[PDB]
Design a protein around this ligand. Structure first.
Ligand SMILES: O=P(O)(O)OC[C@H]1O[C@H](O)[C@@H](O)[C@@H](O)[C@@H]1O
Ligand SMILES: O=P(O)(O)OC[C@H]1O[C@H](O)[C@@H](O)[C@@H](O)[C@@H]1O
Ligand SMILES: CC(=O)N[C@@H]1[C@@H](O)[C@H](O)[C@@H](CO)O[C@@H]1O
Ligand SMILES: CC(=O)N[C@@H]1[C@@H](O)[C@H](O)[C@@H](CO)O[C@@H]1O
Lengths: 263, 263
């Protein structure tokens, strides 16, 4: 009712793009990975226990301990405290709660079922077919093959992102990332390089792009300076944050990470 | 007095930028590596013997065989035949000739002397202090701390690059790459993502950027679709060529490669 369940039924395919959104050229990658139950992980910052310690680490640091073939930044977090925000299940271990808020979620149950959308506390704690991986974003981009941004603005909590108003967060140009799946049950990761209010895409544009790629459900993960794409442990994107006291670009220390590893 | 000699004076510094050239945001990397006599190699495509066999291989393929920490596409080539163009010396092995043409060159001799500029056949074939690495480009960007593109346009042969007229090659927007060195004798590698006549920079813009980073000599290497940046064997740039029959971007099979590796 409030979420989509996809029953469960080959190295990941990493695609590089430079595409035009509203006339602007935006670079990024689309990753497609089969057998998510075997290859998909949600990782805590700096290894197990990171969310409890409120640790912040770069996607590179977190991914290299896990030997991820493809890693991207994960959920939203409080920059000043390192608190993980939203429900998180990391390799069977629940390490973050929604705190009453309703936000877009994506995860996989123990039998391989992919779940996307708004989950109650009871659904998250279900011991029957428990979640093995789960994280929260902000805005349910695609529901059952249709854009669901209008509905997200109407119903989703707006206490997690710090970009500004919900409308600005939805419509501003920025770096963006998203997670979802296609109709064959393959995991889909997306990222686009950008910089808030300067370069990149908004959520309407990302949702259209993903529908073209066959995505049937997907949520928006952390963007802006948090957006990071790490390929075999190497940074392969252009972060927007500047390094300290110079104008070079530097990857942000973030919280949870989404990982695709070998089965 | 047609070339410059720089006497021999930590891991390499890899920096990411997104920088603005006339209001266009251009992304790329600047690499700086010490002790080039021990850490810098020019590689033949695929493996040793690539030039004699007219091999074309991606920078990734060529670099994974050499264990490069940083790799970029090298000199110019003929796409239809795979012929290596210009003088090439790869770890002491001479594998390509100038054919009488005059083009910007960059090399290091056995004692560590860094050499940039125009070289006679006698200088290339010298055996007293022989070249251990050497490759040729098109346009001498910076000579002893001053831009030298006007002089290069005045003197360099124009039979190697296939972009079009000399003026277009210099002034057109595109993906670009460059090799040079700073006054501490360190190797500098530069690349900017782009697409000929759509995105990127021209040679004047790249030359101005390199001067601000302390580059005292540099030449222009193969740009356009050839431009590739590979870090620890993983592609970390956005090539402009499309893959066969789809919207995704694919690295180009190129010729010689410039490599920074362990000493
Ligand atoms: O991640 P974004 O969208 O680029 O925002 C990053 C910026 O947000 C606000 O301006 C501040 O909190 C700054 O710390 C930061 O420069
Ligand atoms: O490396 P570049 O600059 O992108 O050039 C690639 C292009 O060169 C030529 O002009 C044409 O044959 C094009 O069809 C080709 O795609
Ligand atoms: C465009 C975008 O998503 N920016 C996000 C912001 O919303 C979020 O509050 C913060 C920490 O999670 O990271 C980034 O700044
Ligand atoms: C703008 C630019 O660098 N273009 C080059 C072209 O000049 C060269 O002829 C070809 C093969 O080396 O590769 C790229 O297309």
């Amino acid at each position: 009712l409030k979420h989509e369940n996809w029953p469960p039924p080959g190295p990941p395919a990493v695609r590089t793009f430079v595409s035009h959104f509203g006339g602007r050229a935006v670079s990024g990658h689309l990753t497609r990975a089969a057998a998510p139950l075997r290859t998909f992980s949600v990782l805590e910052p700096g290894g197990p226990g990171g969310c409890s310690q409120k640790r912040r680490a770069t996607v590179e640091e977190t991914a290299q301990a896990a030997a991820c073939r493809i890693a991207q930044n994960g959920g939203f977090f409080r920059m000043n405290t390192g608190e993980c925000l939203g429900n998180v299940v990391s390799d069977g271990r629940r390490v973050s709660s929604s705190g009453g808020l309703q936000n877009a979620q994506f995860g996989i149950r123990r039998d391989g079922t992919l779940v996307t959308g708004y989950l109650s506390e009871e659904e998250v704690l279900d011991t029957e077919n428990p979640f093995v991986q789960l994280l929260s974003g902000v805005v349910w981009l695609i529901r059952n093959g249709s854009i669901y941004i209008n509905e997200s603005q109407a119903t989703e909590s707006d206490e997690t992102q710090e970009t500004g108003s919900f409308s600005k967060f939805v419509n501003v140009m920025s770096a963006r990332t998203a997670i979802g799946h296609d109709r064959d049950g393959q995991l889909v990761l997306f990222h686009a390089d950008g910089q808030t209010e300067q370069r990149g895409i908004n959520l309407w544009e990302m949702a259209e792009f993903l529908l073209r790629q066959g995505v049937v459900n997907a949520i928006n993960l952390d963007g802006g300076g948090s957006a990071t794409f790490v390929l075999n442990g190497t940074l392969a994107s252009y972060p927007s944050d500047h390094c300290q006291d110079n104008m070079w670009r530097c990857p942000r220390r973030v919280s949870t990470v989404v990982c695709v590893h070998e089965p």
